[PDB]
Design an enzyme around this catalytic site. Structure first.
Site, PDB file in Angstrom:
ATOM      1  CB  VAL A  92      46.743  12.290  12.652  1.00 33.25           C
ATOM      2  CG1 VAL A  92      47.790  12.366  13.762  1.00 33.25           C
ATOM      3  CG2 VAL A  92      46.789  13.551  11.798  1.00 33.25           C
ATOM      4  CD  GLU A  93      45.085   8.453  16.626  1.00 34.57           C
ATOM      5  OE1 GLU A  93      45.918   7.551  16.878  1.00 34.57           O
ATOM      6  OE2 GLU A  93      44.914   9.442  17.364  1.00 34.57           O
ATOM      7  CB  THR A  94      45.681   4.002  11.311  1.00 33.46           C
ATOM      8  OG1 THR A  94      44.419   4.415  10.764  1.00 33.46           O
ATOM      9  CG2 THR A  94      45.479   3.634  12.762  1.00 33.46           C
ATOM     10  CE1 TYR A 105      44.345  13.951  17.957  1.00 32.38           C
ATOM     11  CE2 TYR A 105      46.124  12.523  17.208  1.00 32.38           C
ATOM     12  CZ  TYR A 105      44.773  12.767  17.377  1.00 32.38           C
ATOM     13  OH  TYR A 105      43.860  11.834  16.943  1.00 32.38           O
TER      14      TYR A 105
END
Ligand SMILES: CC(=O)N[C@@H]1[C@@H](O)[C@H](O)[C@@H](CO)O[C@H]1O
Ligand code: NA
EC number: 4.2.2.n1
Length: 312
Positions: A112-114, A295
């Site tokens: 999800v971050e990168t 998230y």
């Protein structure tokens, strides 16, 4: 030979007449032994990004959750997650043993971050942090400490402060760690003696140590979907009700809740209706990484989707 340049007290660039920058430069020299001139040469190169200032200011049932969910949980994403998982399976298994944090969680976070190192950020960290430190009163103190730690990090890992890139808030690497998360939670999991946030193995251990540090309970349930509806009670990851209270609102756990006597009331907008969940402590731990119900559920479910795609 040596050029002390004592007489060069005024720097150019975007922060040339900035009072906040001059204060910062003084603190770094006094508190950390930085050389005023060298620091000025760095900060004189720093840019004041209006986009960073605009983005920090910018921050039914209509299908809210579904729109957020499909931004991450897609065939293409789940397939790449499988590849990243199998590629870094040793680091993932080693992190589980040392920290108690499961592979699907670390895979979901980095996913999800990168998107596993695919989207790590294009903004220079110094520009972002210097902009939010010297031209953003609302969070200037918080970002000043981030720029401080970043400068010290670039000194401790022998990095040139200008070569590092990341988010509009100054988050770095695979796990998008803030400078203070690097300081307090990043670890040398690759064993090379260095802590690189842009190294997949280090990123894995650091995300694992972050979780444990924030209370991740090994093997404990993250969340359990509920049968029934509870429209009268407020909701979100910050709420707190007892199992007896939730039961009284017309809810029941689709799975045994163990010894848990309390949970948060999570509500996901699934278009046709609302979906209620018993938010357990491990769910909250996920939100300590990024304060958001969506998230945390996206991180968990993405990891679950990849876990199944490997099984097959
Ligand atoms: C993984 C990481 O670094 N997360 C930080 C978190 O520590 C901090 O609480 C929050 C502040 O709003 O910002 C996140 O970016
Ligand atoms: Na390392």
């Amino acid at each position: 030979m040596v050029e002390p340049q004592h007489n060069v007290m005024q720097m150019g660039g975007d922060f040339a007449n900035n009072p906040n920058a001059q204060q910062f430069i003084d603190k770094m020299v006094n508190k950390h032994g930085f050389d005023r001139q060298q620091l000025q040469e760095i900060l004189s190169q720093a840019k004041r990004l209006d986009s960073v200032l605009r983005l920090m200011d910018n921050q039914g049932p209509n299908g809210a959750w579904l729109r957020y969910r499909k931004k991450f949980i897609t065939p293409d994403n789940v397939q790449n997650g499988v590849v990243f998982w199998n590629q870094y399976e040793d680091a993932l298994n080693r992190a589980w043993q040392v920290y108690g944090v499961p592979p699907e969680i670390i895979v979901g976070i980095i996913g999800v971050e990168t998107r596993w190192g695919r989207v790590m950020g294009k903004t220079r960290i110094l520009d972002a942090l210097a902009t939010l430190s010297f031209n953003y009163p609302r969070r200037a103190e918080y970002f000043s400490g981030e720029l401080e730690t970043f400068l010290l990090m670039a000194r401790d890992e022998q990095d040139d402060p200008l070569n590092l890139k990341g988010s509009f808030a100054g988050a770095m690497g695979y796990g998008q760690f803030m400078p203070s998360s690097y300081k307090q939670y990043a670890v040398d999991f690759s064993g090379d003696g260095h802590i690189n946030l842009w190294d997949p193995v280090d990123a894995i251990g650091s995300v694992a140590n972050y979780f444990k540090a924030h209370g991740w309970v090994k093997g404990d349930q993250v969340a359990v979907m509920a049968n029934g509806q509870a429209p009268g009670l407020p909701n979100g990851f910050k709420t707190k009700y007892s199992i007896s209270q939730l039961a009284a609102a017309g809810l029941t756990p689709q799975q045994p809740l163990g010894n848990h006597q309390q949970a948060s009331l999570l509500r996901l907008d699934v278009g046709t209706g609302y979906q209620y969940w018993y938010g357990l402590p491990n769910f909250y731990t996920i939100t300590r990484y990024n304060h958001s119900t969506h998230y945390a559920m996206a991180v968990w479910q993405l990891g679950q989707a990849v876990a199944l795609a490997r099984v097959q």
